[PDB]
Amino acid sequence: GKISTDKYIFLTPRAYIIVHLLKVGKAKASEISENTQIPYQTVIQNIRWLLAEGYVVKEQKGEEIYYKLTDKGKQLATAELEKIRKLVEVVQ
Amino acid sequence: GKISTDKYIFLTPRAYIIVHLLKVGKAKASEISENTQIPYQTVIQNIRWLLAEGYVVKEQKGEEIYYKLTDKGKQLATAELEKIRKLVEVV
Amino acid sequence: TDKYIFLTPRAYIIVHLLKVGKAKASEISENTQIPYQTVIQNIRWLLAEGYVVKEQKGEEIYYKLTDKGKQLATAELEKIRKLVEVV
Amino acid sequence: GKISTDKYIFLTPRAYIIVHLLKVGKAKASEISENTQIPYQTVIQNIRWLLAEGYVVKEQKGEEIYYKLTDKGKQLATAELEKIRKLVEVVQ
Amino acid sequence: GKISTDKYIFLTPRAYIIVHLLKVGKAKASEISENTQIPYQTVIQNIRWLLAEGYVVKEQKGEEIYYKLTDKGKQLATAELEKIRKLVEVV
Amino acid sequence: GKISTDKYIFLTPRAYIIVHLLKVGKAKASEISENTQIPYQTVIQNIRWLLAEGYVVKEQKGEEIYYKLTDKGKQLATAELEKIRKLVEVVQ
DNA sequence: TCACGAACTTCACGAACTACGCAGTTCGTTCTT
DNA sequence: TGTCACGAACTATGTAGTTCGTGACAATGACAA
Secondary structure, eight states: OOOSOTTTTTBOHHHHHHHHHHHHSSBOHHHHHHHTOOOHHHHHHHHHHHHHHTSEEEOOSSSSOOEEEOHHHHHHHHHHHHHHHHHHHHTO | OOOOOSSOSSBOHHHHHHHHHHTTSSEEHHHHHHHHTOOHHHHHHHHHHHHHHTSEEOOBOSSOBEEEEOHHHHHHHHHHHHHHHHHTTTO | OOTTSSBOHHHHHHHHHHTTSSOOHHHHHHHHOOOHHHHHHHHHHHHHHTSEEOOOOTTSOOOEEOHHHHHHHHHHHHHHHHHHSOO | OOOOOSSOSSBOHHHHHHHHHHTTSEEEHHHHHHTTTOOHHHHHHHHHHHHHHTSEEEEOOSSSOEEEEOHHHHHHHHHHHHTTTTTGGGGO | OOOOOSSOSSBOHHHHHHHHHHHHSEEOHHHHHHTTTOOHHHHHHHHHHHHHTTSEEOOOOSSSOOEEEOHHHHHHHHHHHHHHHHHHTTO | OOOOOTTOSSBOHHHHHHHHHHHHSEEEHHHHHHTTTOOHHHHHHHHHHHHHHTSEEOOBSSSSBEEEEOHHHHHHHHHHHHHHHHHHGGGO
């Protein structure tokens, strides 16, 4: 697929998502888009994949949808985070 | 539209490529491939993006082309890797 | 190879750029019948050598030919002439 | 296949092979190479393909072996040579 | 010139090719390779010799070609195998 | 290596020789040539290999040099001989 | 409203085939012995 | 003479890279009522 575009180079949008959620614990689709500057339609498409893959599960609180990580979607983030460490390790 | 990826949900193959050079110096498009597990085609395809941008250059020795970061490439790598540690300030 | 017994897909791509200047990839593939993938393949190469340059007009993209590319185009053309003139 | 490489920007190696044959009728493998400067191996690489499709035939004359274009060899030689002018429009 | 080799001491790669055609009538270039242990490279160069000598003829289908023995080729294939046993008549 | 050329479609020269010796046992270098369609230079070029491999050894009936199969040698024939038969079997 | 489906373009990368080196090998001439 | 060394031409095959297909994909300008 795309992946390596002039915008991303190093991190894929899905990394900006997961990470963001590791902070806000949960947030609305629109929030993510703006909060990471990634165009909305990139977010919604990627969240489907996340949902479908079981890394994210919705959480209706009011009438607004929310997206939170799952165990599997948390374990995942570690694998990629450590993988992401070994890279930024070389700079030193 | 659709999304799958196993090899890179977090990092782009381009990423894995930039760093491998920073960590080794010069390398044949072959070696790049083998040590990053990024299958050949992608390796060269991305390398050509890098050239066209000014982040790496060729080096014919005898019958073997070598690639290595440029200063512009060097600055970029460390620059982004920096912005990385930032977001990963929640580990 | 069949379609390319004499001329590379590069030729059809280069020349068609000499007589348009500005040009999208998707389009070139139409005006030369050279499969789209076979084309951006060469754009990626062209860009990598300075013979061509991208130019994302806002949201669209236009691949124009460069100074350096211009000369290469002319040069490799006489070669074709000294070759063909002898029939 | 390969075809288009840094050495062959516009012209295949077989262009030279073929042309130089219209320009000498029958030539031998070792020869086709020297007058053109393309690596001998690439030359037979093509010569074989030429025999297959039926654009050339060998001359088992005497000791050395010779190659010359054929009826359908010469025809498809000018065919391609002409529509090269079909391109050099930009050159005028 | 020196003679290393250890695969083609008795049999040229051409035999396994010619013979395999008798087993299927027609086959792709990768088909007969993987099914004769003879490198795909040497196959092409060989069918390209057979085509040139009319012992075989193509037949494009979709994204690949299939090669089939012809009639003048069948004579050859058949004849030789006879020439073979005439020699195998040492035991 | 050459191996397969117009003369050698199925069988190599290394076949017709090893066979000739499985017949008369001890043939003269020269004599192997005539008894086969093999040109002299091709024969000794293969002998020197056989010799260097221990598939063949020398011998003198007077002054001429006769060649003969050996321990390592015959096992080879009675090894390849099987491959050639396992092959043809299919089209028997 | 918000995610969704259609639409454009570029990306990932696998199959197959080519450009071309290397290491044989067929045989024909010098050359040694 | 017989064998070796040279020596001109092709075969075998591996390595890197090309064509061009398929399966994504990023960021749009509409459905979807």
